[PDB]
Amino acid sequence: PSALTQPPSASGSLGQSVTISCTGTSSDVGGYNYVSWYQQHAGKAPKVIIYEVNKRPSGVPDRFSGSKSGNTASLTVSGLQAEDEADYYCSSYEGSDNFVFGTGTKVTVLGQPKANPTVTLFPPSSEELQANKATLVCLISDFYPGAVTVAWKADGSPVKAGVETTKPSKQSNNKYAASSYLSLTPEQWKSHRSYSCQVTHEGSTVEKTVAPTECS
Amino acid sequence: PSALTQPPSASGSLGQSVTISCTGTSSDVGGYNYVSWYQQHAGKAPKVIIYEVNKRPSGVPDRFSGSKSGNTASLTVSGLQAEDEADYYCSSYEGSDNFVFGTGTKVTVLGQPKANPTVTLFPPSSEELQANKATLVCLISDFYPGAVTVAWKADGSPVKAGVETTKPSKQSNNKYAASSYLSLTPEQWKSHRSYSCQVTHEGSTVEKTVAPTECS
Amino acid sequence: QXHXXX
Numbered sequence A, B: 001p002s003a004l005t006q007p008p009s010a011s012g013s014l015g016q017s018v019t020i021s022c023t024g025t026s027s028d029v030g031g032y033n034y035v036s037w038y039q040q041h042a043g044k045a046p047k048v049i050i051y052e053v054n055k056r057p058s059g060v061p062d063r064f065s066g067s068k069s070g071n072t073a074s075l076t077v078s079g080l081q082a083e084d085e086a087d088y089y090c091s092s093y094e095g096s097d098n099f100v101f102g103t104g105t106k107v108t109v110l111g112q113p114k115a116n117p118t119v120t121l122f123p124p125s126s127e128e129l130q131a132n133k134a135t136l137v138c139l140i141s142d143f144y145p146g147a148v149t150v151a152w153k154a155d156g157s158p159v160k161a162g163v164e165t166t167k168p169s170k171q172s173n174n175k176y177a178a179s180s181y182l183s184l185t186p187e188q189w190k191s192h193r194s195y196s197c198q199v200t201h202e203g204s205t206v207e208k209t210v211a212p213t214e215c216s
Numbered sequence C: 001q002x003h004x005x006x
Helices: A126-130 A186-190 B126-130 B186-191
Strands: A009-013 A017-023 A036-040 A046-050 A063-069 A072-078 A086-095 A098-101 A105-110 A118-122 A134-143 A149-153 A163-165 A176-184 A195-200 A205-210 B009-012 B018-023 B036-040 B046-050 B064-069 B072-077 B087-093 B099-101 B105-109 B118-122 B134-143 B149-154 B176-184 B195-200 B205-210
Touching (some): A134 A149, A134 A195, A134 B134, A134 B176, A176 A186, A176 A195, B072 B087, B126 B134, B134 B186
Antiparallel strands (some): A063 A072, A149 A195, B036 B046, B036 B087, B134 B176
16 A cells, blocks of 8 residues: 655745645545545644645634645645644545545745754752752743753853753744753852853854852 | 654563554544544554554554543553554544644554653743843653653643743664744743743643742 | 545
């Protein structure tokens, strides 16, 4: 068999547009008229945008056209918005109560601008020190593209260890968000002059600095 | 929208029977009997494995069971095989033109031991308020399996907008690290009595509280 | 789509 054939990746520029192809067979795509498309965000609930070749369902803002030509269905994203960057699956009934899917299409937008991260360094919560631990968090957010690197320092001489760094997530403005964090002991973080968080993105370093100076 | 709620994660040993749930809200119940379960492995299409609440279509192991009662639908994997590891969704033909998904439930074949997450709430640093920014972080460290549910509160009110949760990233100790944030004005901050970060990890819920302080 | 079992 196949599963409805899609092109692995499809793409457009902002305001431009793309047409996805779902290709099946006379048993499914041709035959019945029940091709729905699924927009799935990166590892997320899949939501349906088209149900019956073209059919407007709950809040599918913008140009999300469904059109099938015989044995091949297709959808379009006229006037590209960046939120549309996702994964698109199609589906057709095949009979005896079954539905088949399409092999997916990763859909990316182009022309989305560059953005350097929002670096927010955080000192250990009073509570967490009362509890005897101490964690420092660096929140790197609102950056595009999602490629970044985080350093930590004791004083200028670096701390290469006890740092756990997140791999970035798209957040609802398309921009990415990553976390970096240092596990210390109270004693440690009292016994230093300044810790810092270096963040490098598109060859642009931000450097936030945290020193034990908390009104806690 | 989010109307069908599913657990952050369902994990077992080989030969162990899981169970996943779709609890629905306010609307239809048995009103809509139409509950379907979908399987989805990493970057392959969704495969339906249950229709009409209990059905089970063609080529579906008879150890996938399906059942609903009240506002709650349950799918079962008996003597689970590795192959069963994926994400599962529920789906319901609600508000017609409204076909609604559960939030997903990842099924995990326990490699290592189970690990309830360490949450660490962090408030706006004073320096940060000096810049008239308000940003709250919730660190979720060292947990397994790698699925978590996040929820904010502003005095028991579940919180609307501001939130962004990263995706669970594996750490150098092989367990998981995810983080969540909220953005406020220093007055959206300074209004409230307390803010909470609430985190679920399959039959285990943990809430942390953080209140406003003037500091400096 | 629980499109008809349709």
